[model samples]
Target: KETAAAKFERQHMDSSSSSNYCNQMMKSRNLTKDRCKPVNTFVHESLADVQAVCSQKNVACKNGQTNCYQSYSTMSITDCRETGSSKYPNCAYKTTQANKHIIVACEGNPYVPVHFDASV
Candidate 1:
């Protein structure tokens, strides 16, 4: 199943070139649920690079899923974290960009991204 984490990565952009980046993305991804999600990440690397991790060394997922993989190289990513409690309907966020190795869970016969475990 296409999981929320994968959808987040696909939807939220990885660049922090704009101040309103997180604000726009948080709303577009429906992450502003009853409130906004605390923190989230979006990888800037190509989708091919993100998927190639499955062919690298395997790792254990946070949820104990055995189909997880860690990136062999650092990847560009942007983090969207809610900042300031301006109230529920009017959520706000801070956008930050960094490079790090990513962890993800894969599933299905072809093995594709299903979850974003974390980055280190």
Candidate 2:
């Protein structure tokens, strides 16, 4: 049997984009898509000068309130060869929109990244 993480990766690579991974995961688990529709998006780093980055891209961002992958640390690969690792070297992290988005969003900041488990 495939590990849950493996299952997620298999599904995501065939289903989502890096930016949409978390949203997709939430939908898959919740069996609903509401979680991805936060009226207020969030940005980890301040959005003072870089607001243009968000605006020009038509992204929803606000001062300290926007959403984007802040850093790349939280990413884990089940097949590094597929995900391309400058860090883990030979492993690709699992994928699911919800988990991947949170990991990328909170990267570098002090917070615990969570994973999905059916047992939980």
Candidate 3:
């Protein structure tokens, strides 16, 4: 069975070239439950690699919160954006790859990645 982490990677990750990347991926990931997810990202790095960033750098969130961390090295990621609206079960997206330090939300006793906030 595919773990949530793995599924998260799959639903969000894309290393290939495609013009319809988001349109295909959104539906492929079954994100039609709420009509469409506005924006989503997929990290091309391994789960362990991503979690390791939790301790890399202590960066303040853009809102001046102290609960965010950033990667020391630039990460390979894809941003999926829904650029259209829907009446029922229809969504569109634009996909783009980026090389930037990822900002993530972390928590727990051992400190683990919880949410991907932005890539910059």
Scored by lDDT, the top model is 1
lDDT, candidates in the order shown: 0.77, 0.27, 0.74
Q: What is the TM-score of each candidate against the true structure?
A: 0.83, 0.17, 0.76
**Model with the higher TM-score, candidate 1 or 3:** 1
Per-residue accuracy of model 1 over 27-59 as CA lDDT, tens digit each: 877888787777888788777777787787699
> By TM-score, who's the top model here?
1
Q: Ranking under TM-score, best-scoring first?
A: 1, 3, 2
Which segments of model 2 are wrong by more than 4 Å? 1-17, 31-120
Candidate 3 Cα misplacement greater than 4 A, ranges: 1-16, 62-64, 84-88
Cα TM-score of candidate 1: 0.83
Error of 3 at 79 (Å): 0.9
lDDT, candidate 3, equals 0.74
By TM-score, how accurate is candidate 2? 0.17
